């Protein structure tokens, strides 16, 4: 069996989804070499767990689970199997025994306009943490106390979703980053 696996549109799309609304896609019965991921100069380290990036061609597996999102700077280090924080316990959590790694690179020249860009949103208020490999897209308000907020903005009533601020004049630690997650299972 020899066919061209669609590994191009997974991270070459014009517009990506939000952090809380990452898209899950499934591809099977396909082969693809991993040498195409060295084209970008600002490409970050693979820092892969379990399976080395060197021996990623001869190994054969079952399925590919790929999801992508756009996050700010100083945020790719929080994507770990065992980790805690804001974006890890609320939007995307990874299993401790999960085998695979992420792919990240700088995207300041694409996901940034001359005005304020707020098309990417992330959630930072939740009542409880989420299980790994769960997407929670919802606009239901939360209560910060005893006040029964029935969808009214005010004291102790805040929306979980907040919009990122991306500008070309911002620093390295606030630049947007295009991150696509790869998962390998046998």
């Amino acid at each position, epitope marked *: 069996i020899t066919n061209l696996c669609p590994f191009d549109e997974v991270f070459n799309a014009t517009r990506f989804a939000s952090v809380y*609304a990452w898209n899950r896609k499934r591809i099977s019965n396909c082969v693809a070499d991993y040498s195409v991921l060295y084209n970008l100069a600002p490409f970050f380290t693979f820092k892969c767990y379990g399976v080395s990036p060197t021996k990623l061609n001869d190994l054969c597996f079952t399925n590919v689970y790929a999801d992508s999102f756009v996050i700010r700077g100083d945020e790719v280090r929080q994507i770990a199997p065992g980790q805690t924080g804001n974006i890890a316990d609320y939007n995307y959590k990874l299993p401790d025994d999960f085998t695979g790694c992420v792919i990240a690179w700088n995207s300041n020249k694409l996901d940034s306009k001359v*005005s304020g860009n707020y098309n990417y949103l992330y959630r930072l208020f939740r009542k409880s943490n989420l299980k790994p490999f769960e997407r929670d897209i919802s*606009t239901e308000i939360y209560q910060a106390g005893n006040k029964p907020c029935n969808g*009214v903005a005010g004291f102790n009533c805040y929306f979980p979703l907040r919009s990122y601020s991306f500008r070309p004049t911002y620093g390295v630690g606030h630049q947007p980053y295009r991150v696509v997650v790869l998962s390998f299972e046998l």
Partner: antibody
Amino acid sequence: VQLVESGGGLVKPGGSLRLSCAASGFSFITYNMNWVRQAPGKGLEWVSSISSNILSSTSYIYYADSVKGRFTISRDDAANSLFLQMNSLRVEDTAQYYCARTRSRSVRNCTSATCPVDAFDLWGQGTMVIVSS
Amino acid sequence: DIVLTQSPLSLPVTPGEPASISCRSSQSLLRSNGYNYLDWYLQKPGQSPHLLIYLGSNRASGVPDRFSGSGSGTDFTLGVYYCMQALQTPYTFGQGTNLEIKR
């Protein structure tokens, strides 16, 4: 944070009018908002409404009783653009149109025929829409 | 569906004492949990109107801590001023408030 819009001009009765609104300084795709028109003689009046894309899976569109089904408006997530199309105009339809914006930021207990909101936090600059044969 | 009427057509105002305006409705706006749905707007001459008092007794940002929101049920009591009805599709406004100074 402010809303800027343009596209006003001299429109004959009938035909189409190009009216667009733009948003900057705040998130556009997570906001439910509507349109507000103000006649030069009397006060403000309600014209239409449109629900957000990510607020609810099923989009909710509302119109006033006098223009129910006459006006066809929509919003665009890309480039922070809000549109308003026209099909037929009357000599009593002249007003000043404001780009209304609500601070509710959520939708609940809303059917396809009614949806309550709390208030309109900010209003953009108006446009001069005048009709003349 | 309904019409909102304002009792004071034109009254003089002075900086020494606060004014008083009212909007009269014809339907109950209490709904659930006592949440009254009626706003108040202030419009500058030749400027875009903004929000000062919202949801009845609640207050919004930008207030000068003078226009206190008071009202319960179908009775409410606080350029031109307008009030909102947030129960049905038509949003009725104020007719002719026009607060002017005493001369």
